[PDB]
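Budget justification aside, the reviewers requested a transparent look at the raw inputs and outputs of the sequence design task funded under Objective 1. We therefore reproduce one unedited record. The lines immediately below are the structure tokens for a 769-residue chain.
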């Protein structure tokens, strides 16, 4: 490996061998069907709301999130980079697809598949990833840096449906070598969203944009239809000329054939036919190819950028609503703009790399932080793009000021912005894209007084329940299978209108968003204040025994819904105390004296009673009335965690919080698989896991990272990082279970998982407050 020295990969990049088999991978631990796409994954390409494309560490374009809200795992084999090399003095060169695999059927059988093992590495530090190719049959060593312009405090480039592939080639030998790099792509119009005739009318064109010191050559793969539908649009691939390289292309090869129409050209001398052909296809799949060819002398390096763009302007949800995607603000809505997007990337990618470096540098340059922590911090951000992200720029046929946004809980539980989950998972948004975060919270504020009296059948027990109660915050903002933003509370497994935690979490999120954006946004507090007061006032009505605290009912009524809480619980009770303190503070900011006095009075009574009912001398009891009331809960002081972040001070005595956190480390972490897998949710005082429910026996990855941040804030530095380390190890390490770029909600002691590709572990960013 002589190429690494010619590129700059950070030491904290996650690494794996190209073609590496992983032996220890986990699988779903539930009886019901659950997504398991394997460990062959990678960092995604594409901006927020653009649809994303997962290119895996084996080189394949395999995890397709282009249909917003859906996860489709299938390798499109025509989509590849390939290389040709010929040493000066040899009769023949060699050609090789840079993919560690081969097609299942006989399509593309002429291509050289099965990129060999131990011949290159994949690296990832989101939004960047890299491949290096160090192969005994390829005298010239190659590397590529691939990324999309995902940039904090930038709502423009961050939205773009584009990726850049910056190639570096170096000749460490003492002979001249001819080299070609080829990008192939299938015309994927009709891959989704088209009910019949899936390739019909697809056609490919070549664009040559020649100006001074810019030549770009690109293929635009579109359809002859000018219809404005979810399925229609364009893909483009292309390259920018650099000194010392020539460009060749092939506009049309058949992907549903043996591929030799293209490969006989490339494998001879790395130079394509330059054949244009705009003939539309009928049943056959078609694709395009863009190549560069160059000669490298001994010791010579060259850099050449390729790009990929996709203009699919309309997203459609299962309930029928069609919306324009955010990037259409910058490029248009007609679906004929892929070249414009590609050109912007090829002319500006160096600027974008520097913008990414500028945001990563403060963390990467901090030598007090271990590299593993940086690995997790950056790579967990994959989910912001990969989580079915929806970001609208108008309803099809509709202009408003704001652009609604949603991130999925996950794909198995296909709900947008699940409130309980975003209480943990929304840290990167408030910290790095706060205008999005505040928009999402205004969306929630708008729902507070919505009433929908129609009943639905509750999944868990078959009871009928009211859809949406006035004054109760919704569980979620809809599903991609239905009507995101329009039809809320798509979730039906339980009834969230009786939950005792959501209204408090909502209030805490509001005050968080004010505090973490500088305590200056009084207009945001003004917009949300009525909903805050409503939320707390409705919760107060659920105090049955008049101790000042809403009562858990011993039936599903908070996020740990099968792990029953009854009476006053540490979890809901602490969240309540913190929400009351937050609302007092908002009251002072907005000069709402009567609110300040009321919530101060409620707070004083509740705090007193919480302490008497639950403090046992070592930790806070799980609750007052369950059979498992003395369980040590990892999340017992979630309200105090958020109070630290919101700078609300002590809601509980410092000494008791310290004892509680120490107990949690001692038990839930260190007595669970030797502290190497995170914090199990529930443990009995005898040191054995609470077996009263499956949820108690799970580590929740996002709960564990949040607990680590709480420990960190309280000065328990070793315990904080040791606690978080288990989650990193399980996710990314060779000794873990192979969950990179699909971090799940939970695992059990065997390492097997529930709900891969989950929002909650974005909570690692609470460690950066
Ligand atoms: Ca009560």
């Amino acid at each position: 490996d002589k190429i690494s020295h010619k590129i700059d990969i950070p030491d904290s990049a996650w690494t794996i061998g190209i073609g590496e088999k992983f032996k220890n991978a986990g699988h779903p631990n539930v009886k019901y069907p659950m997504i398991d796409d394997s460990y062959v994954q990678g960092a995604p390409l594409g901006g927020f709301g653009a649809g994303t494309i997962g290119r895996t560490y084996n080189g394949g374009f395999s995890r397709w999130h282009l249909e917003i809200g859906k996860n489709k795992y299938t390798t499109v084999y025509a989509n590849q980079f390939s290389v040709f090399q010929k040493v000066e003095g040899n009769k023949d060169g060699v050609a090789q697809v840079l993919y560690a695999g081969e097609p299942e059927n006989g399509y593309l059988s002429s291509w050289k598949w099965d990129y060999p093992k131990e011949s290159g590495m994949y690296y990832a530090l989101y939004p960047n990833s890299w491949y290096t190719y160090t192969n005994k049959d390829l005298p010239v060593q190659l590397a590529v840096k691939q990324f999309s312009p995902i940039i904090p405090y930038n709502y423009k480039e961050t939205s773009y449906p584009v990726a850049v592939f910056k190639w570096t080639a170096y000749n460490p030998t003492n002979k001249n070598v001819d080299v070609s790099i080829m990008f192939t792509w299938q015309n994927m119009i009709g891959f989704f969203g088209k009910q019949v005739n899936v390739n019909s009318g697809n056609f490919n064109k070549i664009i040559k944009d020649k100006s001074k010191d810019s030549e770009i050559v690109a293929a635009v793969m579109g359809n002859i239809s000018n219809d404005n539908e979810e399925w229609n649009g364009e893909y483009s691939i292309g390259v920018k000329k650099v000194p010392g390289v020539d460009i060749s292309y092939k506009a049309k090869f058949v992907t549903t054939g043996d591929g030799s129409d293209l490969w006989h050209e490339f494998s001879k001398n790395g130079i394509l036919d330059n054949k244009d052909d705009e003939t539309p296809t009928k049943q056959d799949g078609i694709g395009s190819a863009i190549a560069v060819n160059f000669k490298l002398q001994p010791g010579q390096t060259i850099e050449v950028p390729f790009a990929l763009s996709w203009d699919l302007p309309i997203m459609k949800f299962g309930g029928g609503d069609k919306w324009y995607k955010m990037y259409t603000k910058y490029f248009g809505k007609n679906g004929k703009n892929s070249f414009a997007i590609l050109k912007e990337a090829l002319n500006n990618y160096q600027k974008w790399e520097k913008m990414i470096d500028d945001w990563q540098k403060p963390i990467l340059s901090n030598k007090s932080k271990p590299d593993w922590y940086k690995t997790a911090l950056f790579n967990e951000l994959y989910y912001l793009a990969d989580g079915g992200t929806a970001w609208e720029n108008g309803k099809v046929g509709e202009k408003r000021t704001n652009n609604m946004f949603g991130l999925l809980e996950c794909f198995d539980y296909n709900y947008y912005e699940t409130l309980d989950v975003r209480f943990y998972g929304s840290f990167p948004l408030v910290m790095l894209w706060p205008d999005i975060e505040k928009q999402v919270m205004r969306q929630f504020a708008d729902t507070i007084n919505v009433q929908d009296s129609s009943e639905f059948k509750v999944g868990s027990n078959g009871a009928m329940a009211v859809k949406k109660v006035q004054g109760m915050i919704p569980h979620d903002l809809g599903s991609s299978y239905a009507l995101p933003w329009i039809k809320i509370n798509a979730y039906d497994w339980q009834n969230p209108n009786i939950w005792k935690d959501l209204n408090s979490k909502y209030v805490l999120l509001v005050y968080r968003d004010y505090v973490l954006t500088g305590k200056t946004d009084k207009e945001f507090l003004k917009y949300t204040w009525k909903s805050v007061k409503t939320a707390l006032d409705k919760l107060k009505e659920m105090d049955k025994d008049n101790d000042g605290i809403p009562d858990n009912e011993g039936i599903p009524d908070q996020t740990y819904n099968t792990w029953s809480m009854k009476g006053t619980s540490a979890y809901c009770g602490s969240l309540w105390l913190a929400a009351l303190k937050a609302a007092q503070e908002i009251g002072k900011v907005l000069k709402d004296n009567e609110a300040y006095i009321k919530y101060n009075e409620w707070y004083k009574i509740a705090q007193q009673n919480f302490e008497k009912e639950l403090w046992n001398g070592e930790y806070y009891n799980f609750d007052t009335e369950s059979d498992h009331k003395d369980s040590i809960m990892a999340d017992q002081l979630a309200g105090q965690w958020y109070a630290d972040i919101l700078r609300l001070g002590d809601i509980l005595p410092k000494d008791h919080v310290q004892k509680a956190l120490k107990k949690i480390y001692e038990f839930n972490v260190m007595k669970f698989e030797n502290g190497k897998m995170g914090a199990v949710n529930g443990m009995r005082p005898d040191g054995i896991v609470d077996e009263s429910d499956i949820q108690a026996q799970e580590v929740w990855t996002g709960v564990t990272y949040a607990l680590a941040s709480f420990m960190k804030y309280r000065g328990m530095t070793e315990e904080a990082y040791n606690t978080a380390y288990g989650v990193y190890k399980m996710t990314y390490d060779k000794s873990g279970k192979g969950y990179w770029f699909r971090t799940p909600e939970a695992w059990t002691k065997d390492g097997n998982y529930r709900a891969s590709m989950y929002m909650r572990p974005l909570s690692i960013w609470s460690m950066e407050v």
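The pocket of calcium ion is lined by residues 543-545, 547, 549, 551, 568 (CB under 6 Å). Residues 1-364 form one domain. Computational costs for records of this kind are itemized in the attached budget.
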